[PDB]
Each structure stands twice: as C-alpha cells, then as structure tokens.
Paper text:
Among the best characterized of the CYP152 family peroxygenases is the industrially relevant OleTJE (CYP152L1), first isolated from Jeotgalicoccus sp. ATCC 8456 in 2011 by Schirmer and co-workers. OleTJE acts primarily as a H2O2-dependent fatty acid decarboxylase to form terminal alkenes but also hydroxylates a proportion of these substrates to generate α- and β-hydroxylated fatty acids. Crystal structure data show that the active sites of OleTJE and P450 BSβ are very similar, with the carboxylate group of fatty acid substrates being coordinated by a conserved arginine residue (Arg245 in OleTJE, Arg242 in P450 BSβ, and Arg241 in P450 SPα). In this study, we explore further the structure and mechanism of OleTJE by mutating the key active site residues His85, Phe79, and Arg245 and by analyzing their effects on the catalytic properties of this biotechnologically important alkene-producing enzyme.
Crystals were obtained for both the H85Q and F79A mutant P450s in complex with arachidic acid substrate, as well as for the WT OleTJE in conditions containing formate. In the latter case, this produced a complex in which formate coordinates the WT OleTJE heme iron in the distal position. Structures for these mutant enzymes were determined to 1.44 Å (WT/formate), 1.80 Å (H85Q/arachidic acid) and 1.95 Å (F79A/arachidic acid). A similar situation is observed for the higher resolution structure of the WT OleTJE-formic acid complex, which remains LS in solution.
Author numbering: 0 to 422
The structure:
C-alpha cells in the first residue's frame, strides 16, 4: 500500500517555522527529499504540508478537506473576527460567500479602479510637499479612503489616519501564527474599535437613519438574509463587513513591494508606460513573487492517498502558498521578477495561489482577488507615469525568513514631482 509520511520531527516546531519564515517548507522538502511532509506545530498538532497544483487541487476538494475550526483562535480573534466567513464551511459558507461575490460586479470593480486613480491623482500635491514619503504608510492611508468609500462606509477625513493604523495592526496580527506576542492585545483593541464603529453603521442602516447606496457592502450586508431568512446579528455583520475592506487596505503591502520591484528592475517602469497590458502582468508578478500568505490550514476528513503517502483522517493540512508561487516546475526561474511570464499563463486556479486556490463560490478562495489586481494596476501606473521621485539610501531588504513579508523601510521616496507637459 502507500509509504510512510516523512516528518520534520519534534514535539512542536512553531519556533522553527517562525525562524525560517517563508522558507520553512521549502527547507524541509529539500532536506527530506520529498514533496510532502508532516510537522507538529501550534501546540503539538500534526500538519501535513502539501504543495503545487496537486496539493492545491486536493486542499480545495471539499469532500476530503475541512477548513472550519482550523484557524488558530488568536488569529480569528484579531485578523478575521469571531464568526467571520473564514470560520464557516458547507451550506452556511456557500450562502454567505455568495453575498461577498455579489459585490464583485463589473460596475463595482470599475468603481474601485476609478476611486483609486482619482485619489492618487488628488494626492500628488501632498506628496510633493513632504520631505520624504513612506509608501507603506501613505498607501495604507489612501487605501483606507478607497476602501471605506467603496464599501459605502462614511469615514470622516479626520478619522482616516486612526482607522488606517487600526487596520494595519490587525492585518499584521498573523505574525505569531496564533501564538502569544507583545502586540496581541493592541491588535484585539484595534479590532474592538473598528467592529464597534461598523456595528453602529449597520444598526443605523437597519433603522433607516443612514442611507448607504444600494450595491455597496454596507447596504448589502446590513440587509442580507441567510438561506433560512435570518439576517446576520449586528456584530457578525460588522465583522464580515470589515472583511470586505480591511483586506483592500492590506493591498498597501503589495504597493510597497511593487515600488520595490520597480526600483530593483527599472525597465519595468518604462514597460508600464509603454505597453498597455503590462501593468496587469506587473501586478500579477508582484502577487506571485513577494511574500504575504505563507500557508493555509485545513484538516483531512478521511484518509487521503496523496503523492505516495496516506494522509490519515483527522490530521491537519497546510497548503503551501509561498512554495506553490515559487515552485520551479510551475514558474521558470521562480525567484526572478519577470512580469512577461504572464504572457503564457493559462489562468489555472491551482498555481497562482497567493490569495488562495480553487473556486470563488464554493471554496474559501479570496473574494477580493480581482480588486487587488485592479488596485495594483492603477497604483503602479500612477507611480510609473504620473510622478517622478528619488529613492534614498535605506533598508530595502525583504527578509524571507520573517513573517510577515515587508520591505524593512516601508519603501521611502523623496523629491516627488508631478509629470506635466506644459508645452
Ligand atoms: C491584500 C492582499 C490580499 C491577500 C494577500 C489576500 C489573501 C487571502 C487569502 C490567502 C484568503 C484565504 C483563502 C483560503 O482560505 O482558502 C483570503 C480570503 C478572503 N479574502 Fe483576501 N486577500 C487580499 C485582498 C482581499 C481583498 C481586497 C478583499 C476584498 C475586497 C478580500 C476579501 C477576502 C474574503 C472575504 C476572504 C474570505 C473568503 C472565504 O473564506 O470564503 N481579500 N484572502
């Protein structure tokens, strides 16, 4: 019958995972000479790490994989929220996921494109006026304006900076993989403030005291009823409403990385300007190449025969996101930033998985992938075409051994000047 699963042995390898970061799984495959291995982590719990197209296709087979209950409790407490869409499976999930996906119309996607473009255009003067601009921060603030407006949440200009900071702390809060860390309680408090704020909007909308536009997240979520005819309770509704735009705000990570790429590979700036298709390819290449999501947790519902081993019923599963997006058999020279690779990509649901794999409607795949690519296209076109700027000496390192993925400096620019033909 099948072979015995190889192990990264140890009672609990969480510390070792954290020390090796986005390279943990590749390091283990390499040293064990295997495509699939088991490790215990998160308090002695076994997880079988799977990768590649075959790992992704199996991970998103709902007949054999459970996702409910597999996120670390602390990460639910800070990043996603109690009872969030990420936390449910089966009919309850498909029903609620349809609500998220219903927002992703052609018009709403066009709207997010236009918002992003207008706000960057409107921000030029501010940025010229600054001695230096930390792109990670400036983009998170700008994207807070985009995301709240797109979601139909009215956010007073005077609150945007605090909101952005709260979002930042939440987005960062997967850094310990569910373990204790110094910043955990601050992350919880950020979450409580943002949940309280949104809950009030939901209640006021349901009472008829405010009138968000039809088709926005706030409107649609406040009024939605599940397959049994019941609304979300107000707190859960606020939680899932946040899940429509916190991750939009999180695109600031990719904005920073994109400017990093454009800096390291200056030909890409010229190509963004010259080739209309190229900004899309560039955006896709940022998502593939840079680290953000390391892996995703699930559980085997039944014994699964996979790549010559048997994965036992009840054991954890970890889909390797970083490893799949850097798989040398999927991506020629996976550690080269090369937007042109997208000229030949067939659109598979199972290779380009930085925001999950599988199906939008029946799997837990990111609802916001289209938005992410849109926002990145517009933002990179802006920085490539609309302004010039200098990049001072700074710490540009992206440490692959440290979750979460960041440019150490945030990516700082100076001497911003609008590009204007005045002749
Ligand atoms: C900034 C970059 C983003 C990253 C790296 C990202 C990544 C991910 C990943 C890895 C998942 C989980 C896939 C799985 O569990 O199988 C996910 C789920 C989700 N994403 Fe994103 N995402 C991003 C942006 C967005 C945007 C912009 C939105 C909304 C506008 C969004 C909404 C969601 C939702 C609602 C889910 C949960 C779907 C479900 O559980 O069925 N994401 N995302």
């Amino acid at each position: 019958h099948m072979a015995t699963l190889k192990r990264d042995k140890g009672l609990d390898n969480t510390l070792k995972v954290l020390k090796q970061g986005y390279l943990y799984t590749t390091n283990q495959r390499n040293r064990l000479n295997t495509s699939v291995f088991q490790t215990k982590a998160l308090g002695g719990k076994p997880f079988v790490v799977v990768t590649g197209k075959e790992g992704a296709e199996m991970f998103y087979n709902n007949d054999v994989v459970q996702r409910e209950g597999m996120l670390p409790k602390r990460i639910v407490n800070t990043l996603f929220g109690k009872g969030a869409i990420h936390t449910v499976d089966g009919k309850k999930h498909v029903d609620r996921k349809a609500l998220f996906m219903s927002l992703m119309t052609e018009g709403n996607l066009n709207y997010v494109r236009e918002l992003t473009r207008t706000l960057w255009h409107a921000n030029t003067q501010r940025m010229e006026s600054m001695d230096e601009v930390n792109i990670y921060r400036e983009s998170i603030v700008l994207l807070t304006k985009v995301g709240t407006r797109w979601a139909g949440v009215q956010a007073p200009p005077e609150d945007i900076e605090r909101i952005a900071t709260d979002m930042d702390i939440m987005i960062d809060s997967f850094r310990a993989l569910g373990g204790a860390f110094k910043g955990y309680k601050a992350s919880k408090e950020a979450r409580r403030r943002v949940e309280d704020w949104l809950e009030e909007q939901i209640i006021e909308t349901r009472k008829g005291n405010i009138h968000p536009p039809e088709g926005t997240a706030l409107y649609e979520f406040a009024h939605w009823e599940d397959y049994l005819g019941n609304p979300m309770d107000s707190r859960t509704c606020a939680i899932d409403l946040m899940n429509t735009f916190r991750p939009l705000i999180a695109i600031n990570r990719f904005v920073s990385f994109g400017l990093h790429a454009m800096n390291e590979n200056p030909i890409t700036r010229e190509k963004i300007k010259s080739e209309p298709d190229y900004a899309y390819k560039f955006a896709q290449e940022v998502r593939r190449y840079y680290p953000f999501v390391p892996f995703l947790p699930g559980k085997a519902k039944v014994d699964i025969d996979f790549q010559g081993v048997t994965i036992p019923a009840g054991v954890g599963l970890a889909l390797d996101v970083y490893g799949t997006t850097h798989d040398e058999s999927l991506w020629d020279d996976p550690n080269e930033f090369r937007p042109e690779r997208f000229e030949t990509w067939d659109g598979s649901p199972f290779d380009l998985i930085p925001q999950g794999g599988g199906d939008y409607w029946t799997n837990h795949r990111c609802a916001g992938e289209w938005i992410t690519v849109i926002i990145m296209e517009e933002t990179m076109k802006y920085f490539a075409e609309k302004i010039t700027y200098d990049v001072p000496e700074q710490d540009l390192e992206v440490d692959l051994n440290s979750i979460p993925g960041y440019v150490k400096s945030g990516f700082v620019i100076k001497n911003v000047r609008e590009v204007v033909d005045r002749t």
